Design a binder for this molecule. Structure first.
Ligand code: HEM
Ligand code: NAG
Ligand code: NAG
Ligand code: NAG
Ligand code: MG
Length: 325
């Protein structure tokens, strides 16, 4: 494993849809997944265009192409790699499971790519459906039209944090009413709120950086993995700034439906925004450990290295935990 890249030496706004990074359509076999950010980076060649990359490639791409901040890039990338990537080959698919990540570790590890439900990906996504409905990764036109509708009703036609606050809650209520397996606890509880800020913070041209995303740009990223022509990245590093506005609109407790629709039951063992270090500890002690309960020597070494890297991204002042000693 390579060391996590450091922050950008020069984090100014600049043209990122440039001659060295043209958009190209998918070739047969090219993988795209539930993340429009990574999808766009792959479709512009900031990441390998086949959608399989190393963690260091992913961190460099999100920083260079979008100005995602270093700590957020490290946390998200190593969390995804630990639960969805191949720790021996250092490869992660940004979408479906593929033999391109190499020989698989033993069960119960899945190495299922970012499409794997319940590890990183989860319910109440904005433009992707819940896994229970058949497809947790492809762009959904009905769901995007609802994002456009909420942008028209709360953002004057643009997506901003006010729209994020309303749409986030709508998608939660929709999942409670229709997905008997809806889960909204721990890691997904955090990412569901965080990801609603990214279109306002990172898909808005950095020469404006006004938090107002137009629907042409929104469709370009969410559906076609394509930067607008002449797109300038954000003018400074960021990730979740403004997530407080989304939470404040409709504060929620972590929980899940319990096998039936309209059965949302709070989980008092879940972490929440008052316990960010618990989210990290449960991710390592329960999610990662459940995939790798008794690893052999080479896997244990790779796990420990990637867990050290994950810890570098932990933003709360937290204590590191060591599931393999
Ligand atoms: C740094 C590494 C990253 C990783 C590992 C990652 C991974 C993911 C995954 C697995 C999802 C699916 C969560 C869900 O079920 O909705 C997701 C969603 C999302 N990501 Fe990323 N991502 C990263 C960076 C970024 C960046 C840099 C951007 C923007 C420039 C971005 C924008 C988004 C958005 C907007 C969503 C929500 C999609 C939706 O709900 O319709 N991500 N990401
Ligand atoms: C998209 O989402 C809508 C609304 O949840 C759902 O009815 C539909 O089956 C999904 N799939 C496609 C391919 O549109
Ligand atoms: C979103 O846009 C609406 C309409 O322009 C505005 O009232 C609201 O303050 C905006 N929210 C932001 C910028 O967070
Ligand atoms: C995680 O495991 C460590 C021991 O490795 C323990 O000290 C810590 O309390 C655990 N955290 C949880 C279960 O949240
Ligand atoms: Mg999802």
């Amino acid at each position: 494993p390579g060391l996590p890249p450091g922050p950008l030496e020069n984090s100014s706004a600049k043209l990122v849809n440039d001659e060295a990074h043209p958009w190209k359509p998918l070739r047969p076999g090219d993988i795209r997944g539930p993340c429009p950010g990574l999808n766009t980076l792959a479709s512009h060649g900031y990441l390998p265009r086949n959608g399989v990359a190393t963690p260091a490639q992913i961190i460099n791409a999100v920083q260079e192409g979008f100005n995602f901040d270093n700590q957020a890039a490290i946390f998200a990338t190593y969390a995804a790699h630990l639960v969805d990537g191949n720790l021996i080959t250092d490869l992660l698919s940004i979408g479906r499971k593929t033999r391109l990540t190499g020989p698989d570790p033993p069960p119960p590890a899945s190495v299922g790519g970012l499409n794997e439900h319940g590890t990183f990906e989860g319910d109440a996504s904005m433009t992707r459906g819940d896994a229970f409905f058949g497809n947790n990764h492809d762009f959904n036109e009905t769901l995007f039209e609802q994002l456009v509708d909420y942008s028209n009703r709360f953002g004057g036609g643009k997506y901003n944090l006010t729209v994020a606050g309303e749409l986030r809650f709508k998608r939660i209520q929709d999942s409670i009413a229709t997905n008997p397996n809806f889960s909204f606890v721990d890691f997904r509880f955090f990412t569901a709120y965080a990801e609603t800020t990214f279109p306002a913070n990172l898909f808005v041209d950095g020469r404006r950086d006004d938090g107002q995303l137009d629907m042409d740009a929104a469709r370009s990223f969410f559906q076609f993995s394509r930067m607008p022509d002449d797109f300038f990245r954000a003018p400074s590093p960021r990730s979740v700034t403004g997530v407080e506005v989304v939470v404040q609109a409709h504060p929620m407790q972590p929980g899940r439906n319990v096998g039936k629709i309209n059965s949302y039951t709070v989980d008092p063992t879940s972490s929440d925004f008052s316990t960010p270090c618990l989210m990290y500890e449960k991710f390592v002690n329960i999610t990662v450990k459940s995939l790798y309960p008794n690893p052999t020597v080479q896997l244990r070494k790779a796990l420990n290295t990637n867990l050290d890297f994950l810890f570098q991204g932990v933003a709360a002042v937290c204590t590191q935990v060591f599931p393999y000693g």
